[PDB]
RNA sequence: CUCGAGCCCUAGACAGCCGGGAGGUGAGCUUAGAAGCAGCUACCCUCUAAGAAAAGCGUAACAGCUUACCGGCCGAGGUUU
């Protein structure tokens, strides 16, 4: 049979560490890792920490750990395939699927790819050094003119936007310019709350419509405030502007 | 012309004053006054209201020069010594660059600083190499913690 | 073609393909500049699933291409002798 003889030590230690992480953070979930560069992933882990913690390992070692637990955490296994990693937090599930968006994926766009974002190069002064850089921008986008201190960028217009890929040389002048125009992100495949698992597709919808119903409720009170024949605080200007106003509707009107 | 200049002084002449005239003048003088003098920085164009700036943070190897004295590093590190750098001085260099380091606190940030200090033969007390053990044993906690 | 021995492997090996190979930092010294990679010495430290103070190309020097190292896809043997 193709199983090994003795399970290697580090595989055992890692399953323990993963279980340890899982034990804390009363809300736990699996997300993506998508594809994402190291420095960018660090900066996702480097945002304040202290809210959620990202735990990466082999999908099999994450799946071992969920089987050691599982009073609730078994069903989290069907959501583990692909590149993927564990997340856990003391925070709420609904606030969990947010803040993941916070400072995510600058995405430098290596050559050979199509980005849904705008690759437009702006106008300003970079001026690395007088040289082929003047001609480097010429073979891609709006010309670079050298004015009195160094090379500069003239036109603020677009080079490429969407529907095709990036030039190889552009990718290198986008790297020299320090341009990262793409958005991918760290997804969330599922999460476990108290007794139940939350799939992002259902019940996880989000904020304007809440801020739309929340202002509609405050306007619901001020609409009934002066019709109460009562006295209010901020609604005190109700009668103040109705003093000399509606009085003429019973006098001047008819 | 561009906007940038070293120094921890106030308004070091021609890069700043001449270019900034309408309508902002000298209102940016507060930002570049940082103690170390050098702090090369870059000022972004702004609206008429105030100004906008960012602070470029100097390298770590050169950050320990302005503390430990003579700037020549060790020819043979962990052999010849510069020599010394005080322990609380390292605390200062560590709080200096927050984003330039990946650490979540001063404790680990210090380790990187002293990490580099091995290369220059900085010999913080007895030797830069012993530092990780010492600080992991909670030696210097009075400083950091 | 046959007979052994060791090691690795469904806690997913071997190969391939995809993704990631990060920050202090362009380590110090040398040098006009010596940026993993002319040379001498050291070879620490963080973030990590993991990533050398760089194993090999490459540059006038930086680009740039890989190797180490980690994750995924795949699934049954692989590898040394
Ligand atoms: Cl995937």
From Swiss-Prot, chain A:
GO terms for cellular component: cytosolic large ribosomal subunit. Part of the 50S ribosomal subunit. Forms part of the ribosomal stalk which helps the ribosome interact with GTP-bound translation factors. Forms a heptameric L10(L12)2(L12)2(L12)2 complex, where L10 forms an elongated spine to which the L12 dimers bind in a sequential fashion. Forms part of the ribosomal stalk, playing a central role in the interaction of the ribosome with GTP-bound translation factors. It comes from the Archaea. This is Large ribosomal subunit protein uL10. One of its GO terms (biological process) is ribosomal large subunit assembly. It comes from Haloarcula marismortui (strain ATCC 43049 / DSM 3752 / JCM 8966 / VKM B-1809). Has been called L10e and L10E in this organism; in this case 'e/E' is for E.coli-like, not eukaryotic-type protein. Keywords: Ribonucleoprotein, Ribosomal protein, RNA-binding, rRNA-binding. Belongs to the universal ribosomal protein uL10 family. GO terms for molecular function: large ribosomal subunit rRNA binding; structural constituent of ribosome.
Curated annotation (Swiss-Prot), chain B:
Keywords: Ribonucleoprotein, Ribosomal protein, RNA-binding, rRNA-binding. One of its GO terms (cellular component) is large ribosomal subunit. Pfam families: Ribosomal_L11, Ribosomal_L11_N. PROSITE patterns: RIBOSOMAL_L11. GO terms for molecular function: large ribosomal subunit rRNA binding; structural constituent of ribosome. Forms part of the ribosomal stalk which helps the ribosome interact with GTP-bound translation factors. Part of the 50S ribosomal subunit. Forms part of the ribosomal stalk which helps the ribosome interact with GTP-bound translation factors. Forms a heptameric L10(L12)2(L12)2(L12)2 complex, where L10 forms an elongated spine to which 3 L12 dimers bind in a sequential fashion. This is Large ribosomal subunit protein uL11. It comes from Haloarcula marismortui (strain ATCC 43049 / DSM 3752 / JCM 8966 / VKM B-1809). The lineage of its organism: Archaea, Methanobacteriati, Methanobacteriota, Stenosarchaea group, Halobacteria. The gene is rpl11.
């Amino acid at each position: 049979e193709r199983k090994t003889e003795t399970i290697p030590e580090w595989k055992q230690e890692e399953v323990d560490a993963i279980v340890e992480m899982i034990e804390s953070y009363e809300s736990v979930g699996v997300v993506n890792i998508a594809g994402i560069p190291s420095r960018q992933l660090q900066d996702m882990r480097r945002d304040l920490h202290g809210t959620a913690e990202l735990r990466v390992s082999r999908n099999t070692l994450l799946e071992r750990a969920l089987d050691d637990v599982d009073d609730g955490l078994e069903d989290l296994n069907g959501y583990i395939t692909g590149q993927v990693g564990l997340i856990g937090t003391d925070d709420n599930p609904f606030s969990l699927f947010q803040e993941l968006e916070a400072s995510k994926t600058p995405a430098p766009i290596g050559a050979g790819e199509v980005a849904p974002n705008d690759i437009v190069i702006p106008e300003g002064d970079t001026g690395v050094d007088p040289g082929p850089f003047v001609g480097e921008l010429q073979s891609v986008g709006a010309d670079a003119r050298i004015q009195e201190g160094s090379i500069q960028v003239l036109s603020d217009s677009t080079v490429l936007d969407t529907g095709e890929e990036v030039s190889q040389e552009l990718s290198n002048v986008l790297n020299e310019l320090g341009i990262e125009p793409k958005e991918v992100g760290l997804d969330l495949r599922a999460v476990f709350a108290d007794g139940v698992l939350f799939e992002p597709e259902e019940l996880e919808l989000d904020x304007x419509x809440x801020x739309x119903x929340x202002x509609x409720x405050x306007x619901x009170x001020x609409x009934x405030x002066x019709x109460x024949x009562x006295x209010x605080x901020x609604x005190x200007x109700x009668x103040x502007x109705x003093x000399x106003x509606x009085x003429x509707x019973x006098x001047x009107x008819x | 012309i561009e906007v940038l200049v070293p120094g921890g002084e106030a308004n070091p002449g021609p890069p700043l004053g001449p270019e900034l005239t309408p309508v902002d003048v000298q209102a940016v003088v507060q930002e570049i006054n940082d103690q170390t003098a050098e702090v090369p920085v870059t000022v972004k164009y702004d609206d008429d209201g105030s100004f906008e700036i960012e602070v470029g943070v100097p390298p770590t190897a050169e950050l320990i020069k302005d503390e430990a004295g003579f700037e020549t590093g060790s020819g043979e590190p962990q052999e010849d010594f510069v020599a010394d750098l005080s322990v609380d001085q390292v605390k200062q260099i560590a709080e200096q660059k927050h984003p330039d380091l990946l650490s979540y606190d001063l404790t680990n940030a210090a380790k990187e600083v002293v990490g580099t200090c091995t290369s220059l033969g900085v010999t913080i007390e007895g030797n830069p190499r012993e530092f990780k053990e010492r600080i992991d044993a909670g030696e210097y906690d009075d400083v950091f913690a």
